Design an enzyme around this catalytic site. Structure first.
Site, PDB file in Angstrom:
ATOM      1  CG  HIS A  79       2.338 -18.373  56.416  1.00 57.26           C
ATOM      2  ND1 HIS A  79       2.543 -19.221  55.474  1.00 57.26           N
ATOM      3  CD2 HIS A  79       3.325 -17.476  56.732  1.00 57.26           C
ATOM      4  CE1 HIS A  79       3.925 -19.090  55.060  1.00 57.26           C
ATOM      5  NE2 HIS A  79       4.362 -17.916  55.932  1.00 57.26           N
ATOM      6  CG  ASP A 237       8.055 -13.126  58.455  1.00 59.15           C
ATOM      7  OD1 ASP A 237       7.350 -13.991  59.012  1.00 59.15           O
ATOM      8  OD2 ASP A 237       7.895 -12.873  57.099  1.00 59.15           O
TER       9      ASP A 237
HETATM   10  C1  6M5 Z   1      11.570 -22.896  58.890  1.00 57.88           C
HETATM   11  O1  6M5 Z   1      11.498 -23.318  57.543  1.00 57.88           O
HETATM   12  C2  6M5 Z   1      11.263 -21.992  56.806  1.00 57.88           C
HETATM   13  C3  6M5 Z   1      10.078 -21.168  57.268  1.00 57.88           C
HETATM   14  C4  6M5 Z   1       9.842 -20.224  56.259  1.00 57.88           C
HETATM   15  C5  6M5 Z   1      10.269 -20.099  54.946  1.00 57.88           C
HETATM   16  C6  6M5 Z   1       9.727 -19.082  54.033  1.00 57.88           C
HETATM   17  N1  6M5 Z   1      10.170 -19.233  52.754  1.00 57.88           N
HETATM   18  N2  6M5 Z   1       9.800 -18.211  51.872  1.00 57.88           N
HETATM   19  C7  6M5 Z   1      10.639 -18.391  50.798  1.00 57.88           C
HETATM   20  C8  6M5 Z   1      10.245 -19.314  49.591  1.00 57.88           C
HETATM   21  C9  6M5 Z   1      10.926 -20.740  49.816  1.00 57.88           C
HETATM   22  C10 6M5 Z   1      12.409 -20.515  48.998  1.00 57.88           C
HETATM   23  C11 6M5 Z   1      13.424 -19.780  49.635  1.00 57.88           C
HETATM   24  C12 6M5 Z   1      13.145 -18.462  50.160  1.00 57.88           C
HETATM   25  C13 6M5 Z   1      11.996 -18.247  51.080  1.00 57.88           C
HETATM   26  C14 6M5 Z   1       8.600 -17.595  52.096  1.00 57.88           C
HETATM   27  O2  6M5 Z   1       8.468 -16.868  51.103  1.00 57.88           O
HETATM   28  C15 6M5 Z   1       7.754 -17.545  53.301  1.00 57.88           C
HETATM   29  C16 6M5 Z   1       7.144 -16.194  53.640  1.00 57.88           C
HETATM   30  C17 6M5 Z   1       7.973 -15.385  54.008  1.00 57.88           C
HETATM   31  C18 6M5 Z   1       9.046 -15.489  54.930  1.00 57.88           C
HETATM   32  C19 6M5 Z   1       9.742 -16.835  54.661  1.00 57.88           C
HETATM   33  C20 6M5 Z   1       8.819 -17.885  54.371  1.00 57.88           C
HETATM   34  C21 6M5 Z   1      10.949 -21.161  54.356  1.00 57.88           C
HETATM   35  C22 6M5 Z   1      11.387 -22.192  55.498  1.00 57.88           C
HETATM   36  O3  6M5 Z   1      12.139 -23.061  55.053  1.00 57.88           O
HETATM   37  C23 6M5 Z   1      11.669 -24.321  54.202  1.00 57.88           C
HETATM   38  C24 6M5 Z   1      12.411 -24.034  52.849  1.00 57.88           C
HETATM   39  C25 6M5 Z   1      13.591 -23.269  52.695  1.00 57.88           C
HETATM   40  C26 6M5 Z   1      14.443 -23.052  51.422  1.00 57.88           C
HETATM   41  O4  6M5 Z   1      15.040 -22.244  51.312  1.00 57.88           O
HETATM   42  C27 6M5 Z   1      15.987 -21.975  50.481  1.00 57.88           C
HETATM   43  C28 6M5 Z   1      16.619 -20.634  50.110  1.00 57.88           C
HETATM   44  C29 6M5 Z   1      17.527 -20.741  49.348  1.00 57.88           C
HETATM   45  C30 6M5 Z   1      18.312 -21.441  48.571  1.00 57.88           C
HETATM   46  C31 6M5 Z   1      19.402 -21.558  47.671  1.00 57.88           C
HETATM   47  N3  6M5 Z   1      20.203 -22.405  47.127  1.00 57.88           N
HETATM   48  N4  6M5 Z   1      20.960 -21.693  46.781  1.00 57.88           N
HETATM   49  N5  6M5 Z   1      20.853 -20.445  46.394  1.00 57.88           N
HETATM   50  N6  6M5 Z   1      19.731 -20.214  47.464  1.00 57.88           N
HETATM   51  C32 6M5 Z   1      17.664 -23.031  49.005  1.00 57.88           C
HETATM   52  C33 6M5 Z   1      16.740 -23.007  49.959  1.00 57.88           C
HETATM   53 MG    MG Z   2       3.976 -13.243  54.860  1.00 59.87          MG
HETATM   54 ZN    ZN Z   3       5.283 -14.284  58.143  1.00 57.43          ZN
END
Ligand code: 6M5
Ligand code: MG
Ligand code: ZN
Length: 330
Positions: A79, A237
């Site tokens: 970020h 994003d």
């Molecule tokens: C390039 O890699 C990323 C880049 C950014 C992110 C973000 N992540 N996040 C969130 C928090 C992590 C958990 C998943 C929701 C996304 C942010 O808040 C960040 C702030 C704003 C925008 C997205 C950013 C995450 C990125 O991936 C790394 C982690 C991916 C894990 O995600 C999953 C999601 C759901 C599942 C699941 N399984 N069964 N049901 N649902 C399993 C895994």
């Molecule tokens: Mg943000």
């Molecule tokens: Zn962002």
């Protein structure tokens, strides 16, 4: 002495890809002396004629942009200003999609771009829940609600008051109020807690999709117009997995570094370690496949329907990258 330095020429040539999905944003960061947000925003403002349209003095724009870029933290792996630059540029490319041609006003285009630029400013590299559980001052200030996102807005706007930073000094009061409202609605929608509702509303809009006689999307009320802008920046994003794999993998390294640093901070303090922040118990590859299957693909597939067929190559790249990460799960 009149013309570009040689470093400045190589940078100018990379910036010719500014309208393309897959810009080498990391190379731009290196070549600009860590000024990717400033140079990319400036290029986009010139390209779209925003300085003329809004009477933005060029010196004021540059001063604001440098100030804004300086309030992104260079020690935060994901970020930071590079991510800001990337989201700006991806938003810019999404705005140029054929299905949206001539749909949005200049003020809406400004809002979407400015929102993208400020949307993670002064991010500390930890989540909202971390800030809330540690009793941080920001969580106190915003009553635990979209803590980071409220802070990004506040800083983004407050910086307009620094010396020669008011890029909106010539907008009328009606323009400024409208711009401000749109920017707030867009940045608040970047909070992942809002993702499911935004997507539900995006799906609803695809189900009831209307087009003009020229083939372009019909958006006749604020609520629909803002929903599309919100989803557009939200797509930008969440655009990392839709990019050429050399880019995506750098973003993936970066986000995981950031998440693991948060997990280390949690483990040091005896807090419960947040989902996917445990470097000792983590599957990077399987997490990406989860991210794509449950968050990114459902959003992008819905976006792709909205602007059909403009996003087909983006969706194809996403699906290819997904198979790549699936194939690396041991
Ligand atoms: C390039 O890699 C990323 C880049 C950014 C992110 C973000 N992540 N996040 C969130 C928090 C992590 C958990 C998943 C929701 C996304 C942010 O808040 C960040 C702030 C704003 C925008 C997205 C950013 C995450 C990125 O991936 C790394 C982690 C991916 C894990 O995600 C999953 C999601 C759901 C599942 C699941 N399984 N069964 N049901 N649902 C399993 C895994
Ligand atoms: Mg943000
Ligand atoms: Zn962002």
């Amino acid at each position: 002495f009149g013309v570009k330095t040689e470093q400045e020429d190589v940078l100018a040539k990379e910036l010719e890809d500014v309208n393309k999905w897959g810009l080498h944003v990391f190379r731009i960061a290196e070549l600009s002396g860590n000024r990717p947000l400033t140079v990319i925003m400036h290029t986009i403002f010139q390209e779209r004629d925003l300085l003329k349209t809004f009477k933005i003095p060029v010196d004021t724009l540059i001063t604001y942009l440098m100030t804004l870029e300086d309030h992104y933290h260079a020690d935060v792996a994901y970020h930071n200003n590079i991510h800001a630059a990337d989201v700006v540029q991806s938003t810019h490319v999404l705005l140029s999609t054929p299905a949206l041609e001539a749909v949005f006003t200049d003020l809406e285009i400004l809002a979407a771009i400015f929102a993208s630029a400020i949307h993670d400013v002064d991010h500390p590299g930890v989540s909202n829940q971390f800030l809330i559980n540690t009793n941080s001052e920001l969580a106190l200030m915003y009553n635990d609600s979209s803590v980071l996102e409220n802070h990004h807005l506040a800083v983004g706007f407050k910086l307009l008051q620094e010396e020669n930073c008011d890029i909106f000094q010539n907008l009328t009061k009606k323009q400024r109020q409208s711009l401000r409202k749109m920017v707030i609605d867009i940045v608040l929608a970047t909070d992942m807690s809002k993702h499911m509702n935004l997507l539900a509303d995006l799906k609803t809009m695809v189900e009831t999709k209307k087009v003009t006689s020229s083939g372009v999307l019909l958006l006749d009320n604020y609520s629909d117009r803002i929903q599309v802008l919100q989803n557009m920046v939200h797509c930008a994003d969440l655009s990392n997995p839709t990019k050429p794999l050399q880019l995506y993998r750098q973003w993936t390294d970066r986000i995981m570094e950031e998440f693991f640093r948060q997990g280390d901070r949690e483990r040091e303090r005896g807090m419960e370690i947040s989902p996917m922040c445990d470097k000792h118990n983590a599957s990077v590859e399987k997490s990406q496949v989860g991210f794509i299957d449950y968050i990114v693909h459902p959003l992008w597939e819905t976006w792709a329907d909205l602007v059909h067929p403009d996003a087909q190559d983006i969706l194809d790249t996403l699906e290819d990258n997904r198979e790549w990460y699936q194939s690396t799960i041991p």
